[PDB]
RNA sequence: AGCGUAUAUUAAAGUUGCUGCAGUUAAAAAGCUCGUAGUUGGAUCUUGGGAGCGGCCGUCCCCUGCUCGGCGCCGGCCCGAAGCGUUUACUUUGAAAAAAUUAGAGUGUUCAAAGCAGGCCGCCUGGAUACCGCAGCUAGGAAUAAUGGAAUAGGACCGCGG
RNA sequence: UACCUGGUUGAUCCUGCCAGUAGCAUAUGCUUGUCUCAAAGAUUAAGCCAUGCAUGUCUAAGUACGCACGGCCGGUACAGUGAAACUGCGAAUGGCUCAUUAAAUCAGUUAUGGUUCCUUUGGUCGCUCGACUUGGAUAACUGUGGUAAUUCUAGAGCUAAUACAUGCCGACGGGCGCUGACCCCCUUCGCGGGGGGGAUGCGUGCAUUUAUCAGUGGUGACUCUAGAUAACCUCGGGCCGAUCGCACGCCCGGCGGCGACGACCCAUUCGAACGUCUGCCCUAUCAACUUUCGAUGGUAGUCGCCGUGCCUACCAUGGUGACCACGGGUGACGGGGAAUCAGGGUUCGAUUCCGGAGAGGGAGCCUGAGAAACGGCUACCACAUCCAAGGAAGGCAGCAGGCGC
RNA sequence: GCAUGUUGGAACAAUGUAGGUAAGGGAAGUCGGCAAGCCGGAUCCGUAACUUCGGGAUAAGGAUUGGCUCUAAGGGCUGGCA
């Protein structure tokens, strides 16, 4: 149930037409003390915009946020919340800068209001320069 | 910008050059070479300003045509040649071989050495590039392409080479407790052993360098240059010895020297 | 002309990106190559950085890798078959990257009939009349005939490729860009890829 | 050998008020309540013990573990190194933070605006610091405001069997 | 320097402002004995310029029959200076000023693992299995001339390259694998099976691409480099020294050191570009805005030296904002800094020290590694110059100085 | 269904009736753009003053209008499917 587009979608590393008589999944590590989920190994999904099963480099700044929108496909919109101290009036002001982050299809069961880790990468599109590393669930919601 | 720079300003200069404001407006631009721009110091400035032999710029041009100054195994007659870290400037007529070592402050220190000490110098490698048929090529700190190395020469391990032939003699292995000249940033020109190693993924590793006078300081992985195996230096050291004493103790020793002199 | 820039359009919010400078020479975009099939003619273009770029115009030959034994040969390109996105390039035979072409079967047929010494293609009814490879097939030694038999055993090909060698028109794809480097390199479609493209051909035809 | 005058602007101001404004009679409480964002918010989860030196009072040490090895010692104990042991804001420290500039170590330009010089019948130095609020990173403690556990039990642990 | 006086009333305290009072940086007026320093078309006029100038370079080591000169013993051309040139490099910096310009530039901070890079330095310059140096155009010169007239020109006689092209001696006699005639050895009556030597032919170095298998060194991380197999080597074409100069020597014709320049590929310096986090003037008599001539994403192409709807076909209808999105104005280049000033605060910054802009307003373009250059090229408009009325040419917000203000 | 409607032939005067074409200016003639003439349909973009908010409006305004040969999109019957 893959390749709904017109062209042929595949991974450029694997080869499936050698002289024989299930295809093995190709993946690589991201580093920086992280692991891979079991569904990413067991699945058969293909996406070139993926740190493990694809070609993109995660480097630079590592930030965090929260997921608030899942309307657009293969991407999510996050929103940062932080404060700042003013030296003239010794009080705090509110700041927020939203941005769009590409969403890897291995993260299947993801709901809104969960903490997401974003990582800086090369620009794949106009306003997306970040990928998803890990998603942690909020308070409760065991079901 | 549409092109590179031709001139150089006197104000746009680091602190350790000790170039005053009143004498000149346009600074002597160093030519391109193995060393960087801010790390090196020009030969014409090293002649007329620091050692104070010549005064004008035409006299340095009249000197360099007769081929007196030899730079680290080559008779170089370029007045704007980049001479940087661990270079040997040899002069045959006067017989005063100099060695460029940082002082305990941010400045350098003028130090005369024997010709037996000037026959060798200490260098640092950066990486090992794989050739077209698996031939390892060393990359030094100032681009000396020497191929077919020894396998024990790692990235952090330093080598002791010869000037005229370009061959290694000894090697200092990066181990704990070795003397290291920290060259970079605020902690510039510091001597101390490595008492602790702390790893960090992503960024460079910080090293707590400790001097044996009750002083310790943390410095990143880029400012590491070991000189000897633990407590065995093979180089001669100038005055100051990398103590990092306080400014009150410096004022007290200056007052003691003034009272001793009169 | 036209260039690659981000300031010409609006923002993500909706504001107007107003410039602060005029033209730049590095901001420049050349038109497409749009190569064809015909006699050999390649133009050159000097680009930024003192480099050259070979723009193809017409080319009737190509190098296509047969992925099983990993051996490629120069092969004549005769026809453009089908493109995925733009269906007008099926009618107007303009070659770009990732296009399906018909290529000749005779160099790989000669390589198979010379190395493996087995009849490739050869629809039943027409025998080998010049009698050139029939000498190379027979007249072998007894100790080397076992090596020929061991080479003959591991030479199984599928029927979907056997029909294509019977018609004498193989399918091939485009891997290297003809406008960037100049060489029109590619590979031969095998297995599920060949079934997918032939299913697209059948869905386009009837 | 310096001033009156005119044009922009600061202190005087607590006559703009975070330090640091008033609202009955001088201008300043919506006629009046409800009401969503926003501000802020009850109590409350380890309470001192052991050892040493002086005169109960000031100092000083203690109250998360297991793979590879060296102050070693006799299958075991100590410590040496990597890994990890909810998350912040604030505080302590380090890395990093072009020059000139503001204070200025040294400092007979006869003094100052200076300047980084110079002085002893061949030589010796100095040519530093404070300043660089916020943004990012590293090393300590868990008072302060949030923050999570298992109660339709898919809660830990220790011996397991397929 | 953490600070005051008077004025509303017949007369007294509060609030309220006013009168001064003390400064900085511009002009005006009186006066101006000396000395060390020492600003000055920034404000309106980024409007136009009379006048003179601001970009050149040879060493024995590129090319010299200019007698323009010179050594004479000239004959093997060639001691040397050498006008004018070809060839190679720079001309892509510097200075001027703040119109345009408010997530734009600019300041801590960083990544190109997603790319290039002049020159210098360090390599590289008998790896390939194949003429004791081949060829013709031309600059400088002389001479016939036109043009009111341009740093505007041609036919002729000529001639050279480190300029343009084609391609050799050597290393070089042998190795590496694909093809393999045919012989020979061990067992079997023999075929069958196993194991060495080997006639002949093919390709066999780096640069480039396609695609498979395997996995020396390093990185927090490989689809980075490298190993093997199979081909590519584009005629608008990667390299594989058809180069110049000073003194010099040893052995039957040959042999050798000290130089300059260039080149396949790589590192490095100098940088440019590309990025991400954070910071900004006002206004709600601006609350909704953005778009199928993309506004928000994906697949596959084009383009760029790389990473991006940058542009293309088809699908989804998204995205931002009341924590002021968007629009309008700014008497707004940004930062380091300067002044008054207790502690806190206010104003200015165009300026040397750093980064961006442009040469009357735009449009498009060549050359070179680096330019949409500007005292580079072309077209339109405005200003505007000579003239045999046939035609030609220019853009000082550079140095001094002028016009109008 | 019909054989030009109370007639036939001939040449082609002026002046009548009905039509058109007319270089150049374009209501300047005349109470009087009276008569006469121009614009014209469809698709796409787009639209003011005043307002009883319904009208204005087709406001005012602009671009396109062939032949030949292709590509893509939208349905019933039978036994996720052909």
Swiss-Prot record, chain A:
Modified residues (Citrulline): 20
Modified residues (N6-acetyllysine): 28, 35, 48
GO cellular component, one term: cytosolic ribosome
Alphabetical list of InterPro entries matching this protein: NA-bd_OB-fold (IPR012340), Ribosomal_uS17 (IPR000266), Ribosomal_uS17_arc/euk (IPR028333), Ribosomal_uS17_CS (IPR019979), Ribosomal_uS17_N (IPR032440)
Residues bearing the modification Phosphoserine: 57, 100
Origin: domain of life: Eukaryota
A family per Pfam: Ribosomal_S17_N
Sites of Omega-N-methylarginine modification: 59
BP GO terms, sorted: translation
Keywords: Acetylation, Citrullination, Cytoplasm, Lipoprotein, Methylation, Nucleus, Palmitate, Phosphoprotein, Ribonucleoprotein, Ribosomal protein, RNA-binding, rRNA-binding
Main subcellular location of this protein, as a coarse class: cytoplasm
Entry's localization field: Cytoplasm; Nucleus, Nucleolus
CDD domains attached to this UniProt entry: Ribosomal_uS17 (cd00364)
Protein modification: Citrullinated by PADI4.
GO MF, any single term: rRNA binding
Residues lipid-modified (S-palmitoyl cysteine): 50
UniProt record similarity statement: Belongs to the universal ribosomal protein uS17 family.
Subunit organization: Component of the small ribosomal subunit. Part of the small subunit (SSU) processome, composed of more than 70 proteins and the RNA chaperone small nucleolar RNA (snoRNA) U3.
Annotated function: Component of the small ribosomal subunit. The ribosome is a large ribonucleoprotein complex responsible for the synthesis of proteins in the cell. Part of the small subunit (SSU) processome, first precursor of the small eukaryotic ribosomal subunit. During the assembly of the SSU processome in the nucleolus, many ribosome biogenesis factors, an RNA chaperone and ribosomal proteins associate with the nascent pre-rRNA and work in concert to generate RNA folding, modifications, rearrangements and cleavage as well as targeted degradation of pre-ribosomal RNA by the RNA exosome.
NCBIfam families with a match to the protein in the record: PRK08572.1, uS17_arch
Name recorded for this polypeptide: Small ribosomal subunit protein uS17
Biological classification of the source: Eukaryota, Metazoa, Chordata, Craniata, Vertebrata
This protein's encoding gene: RPS11
Curated annotation (Swiss-Prot), chain C:
One Pfam family hit: Ribosomal_S8e
Sequence positions bearing Phosphoserine: 159
Location of cross-link Glycyl lysine isopeptide (Lys-Gly) (interchain with G-Cter in SUMO2): 169, 192
Modified residues (Phosphothreonine): 129
Keyword annotations from UniProtKB, A to Z: Acetylation, Cytoplasm, Isopeptide bond, Lipoprotein, Membrane, Myristate, Nucleus, Phosphoprotein, Ribonucleoprotein, Ribosomal protein, Ubl conjugation
GO cellular component assignments: cytosolic ribosome; membrane; nucleolus; ribonucleoprotein complex
Entry keyword annotation includes NAD: no
Localization per record: Cytoplasm; Membrane; Nucleus, Nucleolus
BP term (GO), one: translation
Lipidation (N-myristoyl glycine): 1
Residues where N6-acetyllysine is found: 36, 127
Annotated InterPro entries: Ribosomal_eS8, Ribosomal_eS8_CS, Ribosomal_protein_eS8_euk, Ribosomal_Se8/biogenesis_NSA2
Membrane topology: Lipid-anchor
Annotated region (Disordered), positions in chain: 1-26
MF (Gene Ontology): structural constituent of ribosome
Keyword Ribonucleoprotein among record annotations: yes
Bias (Basic residues) ranges: 7-25
Family: Belongs to the eukaryotic ribosomal protein eS8 family.
Subunit comment: Component of the small ribosomal subunit. Identified in a IGF2BP1-dependent mRNP granule complex containing untranslated mRNAs. Part of the small subunit (SSU) processome, composed of more than 70 proteins and the RNA chaperone small nucleolar RNA (snoRNA) U3.
Described purpose of this protein according to its UniProt entry: Component of the small ribosomal subunit. The ribosome is a large ribonucleoprotein complex responsible for the synthesis of proteins in the cell. Part of the small subunit (SSU) processome, first precursor of the small eukaryotic ribosomal subunit. During the assembly of the SSU processome in the nucleolus, many ribosome biogenesis factors, an RNA chaperone and ribosomal proteins associate with the nascent pre-rRNA and work in concert to generate RNA folding, modifications, rearrangements and cleavage as well as targeted degradation of pre-ribosomal RNA by the RNA exosome.
Protein name in the entry: Small ribosomal subunit protein eS8
The encoding gene: RPS8
């Amino acid at each position: 149930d893959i390749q709904t587009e017109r062209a042929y979608q595949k991974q450029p590393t694997i080869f499936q037409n050698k002289k024989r008589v299930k295809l093995p999944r190709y993946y690589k590590n991201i580093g920086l003390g992280f692991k891979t989920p079991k569904e990413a190994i067991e699945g058969t999904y293909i996406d070139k915009k993926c740190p493990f099963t694809g070609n993109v480099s995660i480097r630079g700044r590592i930030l965090s946020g929260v997921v608030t929108k899942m309307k657009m496909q293969r991407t999510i919109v996050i929103r940062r919340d932080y404060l700042h101290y003013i030296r003239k009036y010794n009080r705090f002001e509110k700041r927020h800068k939203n941005m769009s982050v590409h969403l890897s299809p291995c993260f299947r069961d993801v709901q809104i209001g969960d903490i997401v880790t974003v990582g800086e990468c090369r620009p794949l599109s106009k306003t997306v320069r970040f990928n998803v590393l890990k998603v942690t669930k909020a308070a409760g919601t065991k079901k | 910008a549409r092109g590179p720079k031709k001139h150089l300003k006197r104000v746009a200069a680091p602190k350790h050059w000790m170039l005053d404001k009143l004498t000149g407006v346009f600074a002597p631009r160093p030519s391109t070479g193995p060393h960087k721009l801010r790390e090196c110091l020009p030969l014409i400035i090293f002649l007329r300003n620091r050692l104070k032999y010549a005064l004008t710029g035409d006299e340095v041009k009249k000197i360099c045509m007769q081929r007196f100054i030899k730079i680290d195994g080559k008779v170089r007659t370029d007045i704007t040649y980049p001479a940087g870290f661990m270079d040997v400037i040899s002069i045959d007529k006067t017989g005063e071989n100099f060695r460029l070592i940082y002082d305990t402050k941010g400045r350098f220190a003028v130090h005369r050495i024997t010709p037996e000490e000037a026959k060798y110098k200490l260098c640092k490698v950066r990486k090992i590039f794989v050739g077209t048929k698996g031939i390892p090529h060393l990359v030094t700190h100032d681009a000396r392409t020497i191929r077919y190395p020894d396998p024990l020469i790692k990235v952090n391990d330093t080598i002791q080479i010869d000037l005229e032939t370009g061959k290694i003699t000894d090697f200092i292995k990066f181990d704990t407790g070795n003397l290291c000249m920290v060259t970079g940033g605020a902690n510039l020109g510091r001597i101390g052993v490595i008492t602790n190693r702390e790893r960090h993924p992503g960024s460079f590793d910080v090293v707590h360098v400790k001097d044996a006078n009750g002083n310790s300081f943390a410095t990143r992985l880029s400012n590491i240059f070991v000189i000897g195996k633990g407590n065995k230096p093979w180089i001669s050291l100038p005055r100051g010895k990398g103590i990092r004493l306080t400014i009150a103790e410096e004022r007290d020793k200056r007052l003691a020297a003034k009272q001793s002199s009169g | 002309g036209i260039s690659r820039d981000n300031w010409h359009k609006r923002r993500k919010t909706g504001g107007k990106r107003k410039p602060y400078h005029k033209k730049r020479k590095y901001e420049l975009g050349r038109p497409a190559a749009n190569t064809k099939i015909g006699p050999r003619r390649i133009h050159t273009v000097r680009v930024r950085g003192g480099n050259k770029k070979y723009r193809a115009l017409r080319l009737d030959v190509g190098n296509f890798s047969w992925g099983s034994e990993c051996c490629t040969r120069k092969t004549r390109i005769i026809d453009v078959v089908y493109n995925a996105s733009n269906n007008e390039l099926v009618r107007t035979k303009t070659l770009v990257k990732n296009c399906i072409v018909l290529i000749d079967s005779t160099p790989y047929r000669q390589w198979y009939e010379s190395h493996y010494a087995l009849p490739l293609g050869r629809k039943k009814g027409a025998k080998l009349t010049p009698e050139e490879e029939e000498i190379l097939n027979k007249k072998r030694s007894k100790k080397i005939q076992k090596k020929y038999d061991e080479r003959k055993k591991n030479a199984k090909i599928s029927s979907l490729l056997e029909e294509q060698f019977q018609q004498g028109k193989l399918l091939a794809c485009i891997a290297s860009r003809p406008g960037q480097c100049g060489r029109a390199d590619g590979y031969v479609l095998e297995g599920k890829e060949l079934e997918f493209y032939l299913r697209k051909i059948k869905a386009r035809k009837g």
